[PDB]
Amino acid sequence: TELDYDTFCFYYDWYGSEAIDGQYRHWAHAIAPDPNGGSGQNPGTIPGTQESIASNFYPQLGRYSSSDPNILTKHMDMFVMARTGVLALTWWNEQDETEAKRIGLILDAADKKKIKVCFHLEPYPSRNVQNLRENIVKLITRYGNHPAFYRKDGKPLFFIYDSYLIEPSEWEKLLSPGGSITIRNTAYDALMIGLWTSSPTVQRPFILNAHFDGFYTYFAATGFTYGSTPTNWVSMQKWAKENGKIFIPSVGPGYIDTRIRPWNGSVIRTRTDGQYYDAMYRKAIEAGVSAISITSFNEWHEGSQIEPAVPYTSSEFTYLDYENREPDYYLTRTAYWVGKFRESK
Numbered sequence: 001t002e003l004d005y006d007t008f009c010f011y012y013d014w015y016g017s018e019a020i021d022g023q024y025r026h027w028a029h030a031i032a033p034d035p036n037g038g039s040g041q042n043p044g045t046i047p048g049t050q051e052s053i054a055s056n057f058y059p060q061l062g063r064y065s066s067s068d069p070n071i072l073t074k075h076m077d078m079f080v081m082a083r084t085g086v087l088a089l090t091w092w093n094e095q096d097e098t099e100a101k102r103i104g105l106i107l108d109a110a111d112k113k114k115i116k117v118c119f120h121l122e123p124y125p126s127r128n129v130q131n132l133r134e135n136i137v138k139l140i141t142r143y144g145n146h147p148a149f150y151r152k153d154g155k156p157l158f159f160i161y162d163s164y165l166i167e168p169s170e171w172e173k174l175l176s177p178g179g180s181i182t183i184r185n186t187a188y189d190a191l192m193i194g195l196w197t198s199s200p201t202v203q204r205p206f207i208l209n210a211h212f213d214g215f216y217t218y219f220a221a222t223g224f225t226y227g228s229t230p231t232n233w234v235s236m237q238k239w240a241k242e243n244g245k246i247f248i249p250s251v252g253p254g255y256i257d258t259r260i261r262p263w264n265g266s267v268i269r270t271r272t273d274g275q276y277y278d279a280m281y282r283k284a285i286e287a288g289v290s291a292i293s294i295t296s297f298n299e300w301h302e303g304s305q306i307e308p309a310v311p312y313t314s315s316e317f318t319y320l321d322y323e324n325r326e327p328d329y330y331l332t333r334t335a336y337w338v339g340k341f342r343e344s345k
């Protein structure tokens with residue numbers, strides 16, 4: 001029954017409904033142009049109707065709003081079922097008071113089930129080390145005293161998505177102890193977990209020169225990057241341990257995003273009734289890591305979700321579903337692997 005506080009599940013708060021938000025945000029979504037496609041593509045959009053949503057799967061909870069109190073209660077109950085102690089919240093620097101309100105709603109709901117919340121800092125517009133520092137300060141100031149705000153050994157933790165978009169010479173200003181705008185040894189110090197993507201020849205000096213406290217791999221699709229190739233995890237962990245870094249590999253139950261990225265079929269990983277998830281989670285446990293991240297709770301666009309899904313067919317699309325498993329199988333199977341992780345941690 002114990003929640004695991006070193007298990008981080010990537011959570012997305014960007015869904016809307018007509019009733020609450022005035023539109024089906026994110027269930028409606030632009031279709032992405034082919035990066036190798038022509039010059040003047042008109043890929044179109046997915047309208048977020050009942051029949052047609054921007055996922056290859058279909059949520060048991062329907063086209064829900066992330067601000068709906070009833071949905072938040074259910075999501076937190078699902079985290080309890082999964083034994084996942086930390087919700088890693090996507091964060092886009094929206095700046096509007098309604099972002100703040102929603103963050104406040106998630107924190108309050110989480111705390112009722114003793115779930116903790118940390119922030120997943122996304123590549124928001126014009127993100128750089130100066131406004132990153134500004135934002136880290138604001139988040140710690142605004143939410144640091146909330147009982148659900150995550151700390152590891154007294155420290156906040158931030159995952160930094162696509163951290164490679166900012167060079168190490170920039171990162172060092174923020175993350176070196178001698179950095180010109182350093183957070184080290186200040187009230188705003190935190191564990192900063194950057195994204196390990198490619199080969200060790202590039203990633204090792206990146207992580208060292210950028211002064212990240214750790215790294216994660218994010219991608220649910222095996223082999224999409226060097227970092228998301230689980231046979232690499234034992235050597236990645238040995239390097240991390242040698243260099244005083246926290247390795248948080250990311251595990252997922254599958255991947256498919258061809259509703260929003262029709263050209264991206266090569267990245268599909270079928271779930272094969274839970275077999276894919278089992279193989280991946282087992283690999284993370286075997287690498288002897290001290291923490292695990294799960295991609296994802298509810299990234300519906302990318303079909304990596306462990307949130308319950310239902311069989312559904314419409315005139316628009318035949319949705320995938322969990323096959324010979326119940327809608328809540330990925331939640332309970334996550335609990336199973338969390339228990340195994342705890343036993344040998």
Ligand SMILES: OC[C@H]1CNC[C@@H](O[C@H]2O[C@H](CO)[C@@H](O)[C@H](O)[C@H]2O)[C@@H]1O
Pocket residue numbers: 090120122123161260299301302
């Ligand atoms: O949370 C990290 C990462 C996970 N995958 C999606 C990334 O966002 C991008 O893709 C989604 C659709 O899956 C779009 O809605 C976003 O606008 C796009 O930036 C996200 O950064």
